[PDB]
């Protein structure tokens, strides 16, 4: 049965206006911005921005890759799904 989101969880995650998109959810680094609460700070593939989103906009990668891991037009998007399927927990820094 699935647990609550923890750092290094693999996703698609969803912002308005883009299409479901391969992200991580990240660590806070020490010293770091913390995200508001109910809020989980969200890595890009591809794009390598961080959002803060909640679970309603976050979709498990292997439950969810069938559908919406597939090339699309947007910038880093094909890149980012590189990214995720094969060193998804590498430091973009």
Same mark, same amino acid.
């Given at each position: 049965?699935?647990?609550?989101?923890? *750092? $290094?969880?693999?996703?698609?995650?969803?912002?308005?206006?883009? *299409?479901?998109? *391969?992200?991580?959810?990240?660590?806070?680094?020490?010293?770091?911005?913390?995200?508001? *609460?109910?809020?989980?700070?969200? #890595?890009? #593939? $591809?794009?390598?921005?961080?959002?803060?989103?909640?679970?309603?906009?976050?979709?498990?990668?292997?439950?969810?890759?069938?559908?919406?891991?597939? @090339? &699309?037009?947007?910038?880093? #998007? &094909?890149?980012?799904?590189?990214?995720?399927?094969? &060193? @998804?927990?590498?430091?973009?820094?």
């Amino acid at each position: 049965m699935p647990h609550a989101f923890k *750092p $290094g969880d693999l996703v698609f995650a969803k912002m308005k206006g883009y *299409p479901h998109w *391969p992200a991580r959810i990240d660590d806070i680094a020490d010293g770091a911005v913390k995200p508001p *609460p109910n809020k989980y700070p969200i #890595f890009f #593939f $591809g794009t390598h921005e961080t959002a803060f989103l909640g679970p309603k906009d976050l979709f498990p990668y292997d439950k969810s890759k069938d559908k919406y891991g597939k @090339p &699309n037009k947007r910038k880093g #998007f &094909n890149e980012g799904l590189w990214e995720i399927q094969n &060193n @998804p927990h590498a430091s973009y820094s």
